[PDB]
């Protein structure tokens, strides 16, 4: 219908609550392994934020896996920063992590993050 | 960190993508039965929007059910309207459905929806 009203804060409130479920380990259904580190998450949130996870979890075999191992070249802190961005909209971008964050965002197919990393790098050169 | 940047549209984009997963029946993990009607959804989105579903899916036995049957007094169209609100932030509130929407929102423990229903009813009296 074209007659709907909208609650402005709803999408933000949903994301806050999904991150609270992740913090409490409620209904997490996948572990992402990045070298020596493991991160528990919800497949639907990963798919909704990343083109790589969208492809993985729509594959008829990989959709059923409970563990996904990422490429060993992926930096765990870079992944942690991007997973926190997925669940909060906030990206902890710092001089010390920007190259790892950008490389991880390219691998995860997160173009908006890649774009801001490129802009911050270009401003310092 | 206090140094984060934020992507304004992220939470809205996540919700649009979760609703696209629901439309395509991707990774839905529960069927909600309302009298003769069935609705497929994602438990995490329901929990993030409703106090009743938060209680159900944090219960150690009910968290594992793949079908949840609602009270027979719940109107299926009222539930459909609220499920669409959960996944889109938009509530199709009309003179013809407001009483059913309000009763369903009280049962699902969705206080912001109950509040706007009460305001619209009060304005017409």
């Amino acid at each position: 219908a074209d007659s709907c009203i909208q609650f402005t804060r709803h999408a933000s409130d949903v994301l806050l609550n999904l991150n609270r479920l992740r913090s409490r380990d409620i209904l997490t259904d996948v572990v992402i392994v990045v070298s020596r580190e493991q991160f528990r998450a919800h497949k639907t949130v990963l798919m909704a934020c990343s083109g790589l996870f969208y492809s993985i979890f729509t594959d008829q075999l990989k959709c059923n896996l409970s563990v996904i191992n990422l490429d060993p070249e992926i930096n765990p802190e870079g992944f942690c920063i991007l997973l926190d961005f997925m669940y909060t909209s906030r990206l902890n971008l710092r001089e010390g992590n920007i190259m790892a964050v950008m490389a991880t965002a390219m691998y995860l197919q997160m173009e908006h993050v890649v774009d801001t990393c490129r802009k911050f790098i270009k401003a310092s050169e | 960190a206090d140094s984060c940047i934020q992507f304004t549209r992220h939470a809205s984009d996540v919700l649009l993508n979760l609703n696209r997963l629901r439309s395509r029946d991707i990774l839905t993990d529960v069927v909600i039965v309302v009298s003769r009607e069935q609705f497929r959804a994602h438990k995490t989105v329901l929990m993030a929007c409703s106090g009743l579903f938060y209680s159900i899916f944090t219960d150690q036995l009910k968290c594992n059910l793949s079908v949840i049957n609602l009270d027979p007094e719940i109107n299926p169209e009222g539930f459909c309207i609220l499920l669409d609100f959960m996944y889109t932030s938009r509530l199709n509130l009309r003179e013809g459905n407001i009483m059913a929407v309000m009763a369903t929102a009280m049962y699902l423990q969705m206080e912001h929806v109950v509040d706007t229903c009460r305001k619209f009813i009060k304005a017409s009296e």
Partner: peptide, 5 residues
């Protein structure tokens, strides 16, 4: 909150 979208 509520608005006309």
């Amino acid at each position: 909150a509520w608005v006309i979208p």
